[PDB]
Design a binder for this molecule. Structure first.
Ligand SMILES: Cc1cc2nc3c(=O)[nH]c(=O)nc-3n(C[C@H](O)[C@H](O)[C@H](O)COP(=O)(O)OP(=O)(O)OC[C@H]3O[C@@H](n4cnc5c(N)ncnc54)[C@H](O)[C@@H]3O)c2cc1C
Ligand SMILES: O=C(O)C1(C(=O)O)CCC1
Length: 499
């Protein structure tokens, strides 16, 4: 194998204490940079919470709830009398009433500022059955998934883009659908991507790979049963499709990004990337995109490979750095194979340290990589902004975020300094499709929003202080090493696969 390639295979499942200890010093921000990252992260997160004055509103609740000292339900019943007294139009009537004589409709809305259904459930199922089950699951899937979808068709989504593109946001469009099971399914996904490239290209109109929209694709949509697909069949069947779409994105000069999926396909996607990058028809073109997952132990080794690849094939690569979306499934997979170890980290803070270390690796080679830092975590953003150094220029890097999750945070980021933003561009990942293609994406978003470890989850918990929410991962890791006795131990509730 190649020297860069061999090192990747060597790190597939390396001990977690080993991996974390190596990344730790590459991820440590120097004390001056670290404090500036702290301030900016604190500001971003504070404005995200006290947006509708959610923080200070809870303060006046706790204050009057102290002085008067009654139930939380008692406080809500007080607001209801207060609101109905404020609805008395004449003051002299209201006050004389307060002293002479002395409805709960909006107590619901007031409660938010402060088991019998289980009977209905067991009851409803018996008479209704697997039809009721399959309908309700579909129903909640559409209802929860609306917020994550840009449009049902490529044309409806291109239209939805202008509002934010006029403010300096970019877009990457994703035609939903993945893990093709039949040659037909893969063929159809091939069609909907070509149709999308045309639409997004006519829309782009020469704006170019950096400043115009682009497209994101999944190899697993392009080949039947990609899960266990063999090497020779993938190159004969998938690669010509990957080539074709990429040629097409070049003619329109739009970025085309290869999404990263489950970790046992990292090898094969590198093989496809390696061949794509030496097509003569793509020589001198820099529009090829590739996601790397910082939660994998071999991400730093992939970066060394990609850096060498960009040199050998004489192009600048567009590399989306992400943490990763399949962590639950990666762990359950590794636990069932009883394999040597895990390919991903087992403590969330380890992934953050991985991400910070990989970001520095990417920022050091602007001639060979255009970094695209995908994240919704205020501290992560703040740290990359500091790590990228003074004297920003547009093509140095960009941020990325998911439709439905990133806009509140990046609206402090993309925009003019005069209007109080950071003047850094953000590309919004924009899914496109109907109900029939939303399931796997939605589930991954439910796993993301619902985890106690996720930034977007903890920012909502106004009982968690901002200083803990934006705390520094290197320091977190070193605080554990000192309490536990050694740097980088696996998560306690997650033993090694064979145990
Ligand atoms: C625009 C965009 C494109 C993306 N494309 C891809 C892609 O092609 N492939 C892909 O896999 N991901 C991709 N992601 C990432 C994924 O979808 C999540 O959005 C991302 O991981 C969340 O990171 P965050 O820094 O915003 O949140 P943070 O909450 O600070 O990080 C959360 C992440 O930490 C990781 N994590 C959670 N628990 C643990 C644990 N116990 N041990 C170790 N690690 C843990 C998971 O990666 C989790 O998602 C993309 C994200 C964005 C924004
Ligand atoms: O991580 C992934 O593969 C993404 C998904 O959830 O489909 C693409 C953007 C996140």
């Amino acid at each position: 194998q190649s020297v860069s390639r061999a090192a990747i295979t060597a790190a597939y499942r390396r001990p977690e204490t080993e991996a974390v200890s190596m990344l730790l010093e590459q991820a440590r921000l120097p004390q001056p940079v670290a404090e500036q990252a702290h301030k900016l992260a604190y500001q971003l997160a504070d404005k995200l919470r006290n947006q509708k004055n959610a923080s200070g509103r809870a303060g006046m609740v706790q204050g009057l709830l102290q002085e008067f000292s009654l139930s939380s339900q008692e406080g809500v019943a007080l607001m209801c009398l207060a609101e109905a007294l404020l609805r008395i139009p004449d003051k002299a009537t209201r006050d004389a009433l307060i002293r002479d004589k002395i409805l709960f409709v909006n107590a619901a809305t007031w409660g938010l500022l402060f088991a019998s259904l289980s009977r209905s459930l067991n009851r409803i199922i018996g008479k209704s059955g697997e039809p009721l089950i399959r309908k309700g699951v579909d129903m909640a899937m559409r209802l929860m998934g609306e917020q994550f979808v840009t449009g049902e068709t490529i044309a409806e989504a291109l239209a939805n883009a202008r509002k934010l593109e006029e403010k300096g946001f970019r877009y990457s469009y994703d035609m939903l659908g993945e893990a093709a099971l039949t040659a037909a399914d893969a063929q159809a996904y091939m069609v909907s991507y070509q149709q999308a490239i045309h639409a997004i290209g006519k829309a782009s109109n020469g704006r170019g790979i950096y400043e115009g929209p682009g497209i994101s694709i999944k190899l697993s949509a392009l080949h039947p049963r990609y899960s266990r697909a063999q090497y020779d069949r993938v190159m004969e069947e998938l690669y010509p499709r990957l080539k074709s779409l990429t040629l097409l994105a070049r003619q329109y000069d739009i970025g085309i990004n290869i999404d990263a999926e489950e970790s046992d396909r990292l090898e094969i996607s590198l093989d496809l990337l390696e061949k794509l990058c030496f097509e003569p028809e793509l020589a001198g073109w820099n529009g090829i995109g590739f996601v790397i997952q910082a939660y994998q132990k071999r991400c730093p080794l992939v970066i060394d490979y990609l850096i060498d690849l960009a040199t050998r094939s004489r192009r600048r690569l567009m590399i989306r750095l992400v943490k990763g979306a399949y962590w639950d499934s990666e762990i359950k997979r590794a636990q069932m194979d009883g394999l040597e170890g895990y390919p991903v980290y087992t403590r969330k803070v380890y992934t953050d340290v991985s991400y910070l270390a990989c970001a520095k690796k990417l920022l050091a080679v602007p001639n060979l990589i255009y970094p695209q830092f995908a994240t919704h975590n205020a501290h992560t953003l703040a740290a990359i902004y500091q790590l990228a150094g003074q004297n920003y220029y547009p093509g140095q890097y960009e941020f990325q975020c998911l439709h439905g999750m990133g806009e509140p945070l990046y609206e402090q980021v993309t925009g003019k300094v005069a209007d109080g933003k950071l003047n850094r561009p953000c590309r919004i990942y924009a899914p496109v499709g109907t109900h029939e293609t939303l399931l796997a994406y939605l589930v991954r978003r439910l796993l993301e929003n619902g985890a106690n470890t996720s930034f977007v989850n903890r920012i909502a918990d106004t009982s968690l202080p901002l200083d803990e929410l934006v705390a520094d991962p290197v320091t977190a890791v070193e605080k554990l090493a000192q309490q536990e006795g050694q740097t980088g131990l696996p998560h306690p509730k997650i033993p090694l696969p064979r145990d």
